[PDB]
């Protein structure tokens with residue numbers, strides 16, 4: 001009852017559209033999990049953990065979209081021509097707790113294909129995960145108030161975006177200082193991966209703000225549409241490119257399974 005979803009009745013079309021976005025989301029992630037599984041054999045040992053983390057992200061994200069889709073259909077019932085709330089079982093908080101695990105996985109695979117290792121891998125990962133967790137936690141607290149205190153949503157949103165800015169400055173500094181280490185021509189590819197990250201990750205703040213500029217049932221639909229665009233791009237497309245870089249660098253490094261697959 002702390003999220004705006006609880007404030008509205010939905011038409012069958014709005015409800016069915018939301019249910020379809022979530023179920024379609026589950027399908028995409030599990031279908032890509034198999035891709036990442038099958039291509040791990042074509043990735044050198046040095047980079048294989050990068051594709052394994054993609055598998056982890058797929059299942060983690062797929063289970064939570066699956067969970068949301070079922071919570072969505074348990075929470076509402078078609079009564080008198082509309083879908084009305086029946087039980088307190090749907091909430092976007094589940095997305096936030098899940099980012100605590102999936103965002104580190106997405107960051108760690110980027111550092112691995114950057115060829116960071118040892119001391120600098122450990123320290124860089126620690127500061128990035130610490131900052132990402134401060135982004136998520138302050139964001140989590142803030143969205144508890146999207147119904148009751150929109151001013152406090154904005155202030156937690158401002159504290160969260162400060163970690164977001166610092167976190168991306170670390171990522172960008174590491175990519176642009178290490179892109180000359182990369183092989184197979186992937187110095188060019190990693191930069192686009194960074195701009196794709198910038199685009200897809202920034203959609204989550206927009207969805208976070210929907211309650212402020214569109215607190216209605218159509219805003220609920222839009223927010224889930226934006227999560228779905230962002231999920232597919234920050235997890236699946238991003239994963240495909242990370243796996244591409246991993247196999248190309250494997251091939252340029254003398255890994256024959258990688259050379260034959262390409």
Ligand SMILES: CCCCCCCC/C=C\CCCCCCCC(=O)OC[C@H](O)CO
Pocket residue numbers: 123124127162163166170173
């Ligand atoms: C009373 C209210 C309390 C407010 C508290 C202030 C808000 C904290 C925000 C930023 C601090 C973190 C910024 C400094 C951390 C930099 C990370 C770093 O040094 O690592 C970079 C390096 O590239 C890796 O190898």
Ligand SMILES: CCCCCCCC/C=C\CCCCCCCC(=O)OC[C@H](O)CO
Pocket residue numbers: 158159161162165168169171172173176177
């Ligand atoms: C509460 C509101 C806070 C206001 C927030 C507005 C300020 C954001 C500014 C820039 C975006 C951050 C960009 C971070 C990623 C790019 C930086 C980078 O890559 O730096 C390269 C390095 O300098 C070369 O080696």
Ligand SMILES: CCCCCCCC/C=C\CCCCCCCC(=O)OC[C@H](O)CO
Pocket residue numbers: 028031032035039042240243244247248261262
């Ligand atoms: C609706 C189902 C969606 C499910 C999604 C299924 C995932 C595969 C999709 C596109 C692959 C084309 C992009 C190519 C990715 C490049 C990575 C690479 O290195 O290619 C591996 C090659 O196949 C080794 O022989």
Ligand SMILES: *C\C=C(C)/C=C/C=C(C)/C=C/C1=C(C)CCCC1(C)C
Pocket residue numbers: 099102103106135136138139140157158160161164201202204205208231234235
């Ligand atoms: C599933 C993958 C990712 C990378 C999810 C990323 C989410 C964010 C970058 C969220 C950022 C937020 C900010 C910057 C401030 C408002 C609260 C948010 C947590 C949504």
Ligand SMILES: CCCCCCCC/C=C\CCCCCCCC(=O)O
Pocket residue numbers: 045046047048049108121122125126129130
């Ligand atoms: C304080 C909370 C965060 C704790 C630190 C988390 C960062 C973990 C550091 C990196 C772990 C990566 C290990 C993978 C090594 C790859 C093996 C290989 O080269 O094949």
Ligand SMILES: CCCCCCCC/C=C\CCCCCCCC(=O)O
Pocket residue numbers: 150151154155157158161205208209
């Ligand atoms: C997620 C990104 C956050 C961006 C920072 C937001 C900056 C704050 C913007 C202007 C604040 C205006 C004050 C509005 C008061 C709202 C309380 C009310 O409803 O009366």
Ligand SMILES: [Cl-]
Pocket residue numbers: 060061064098099102
């Ligand atoms: Cl997730």
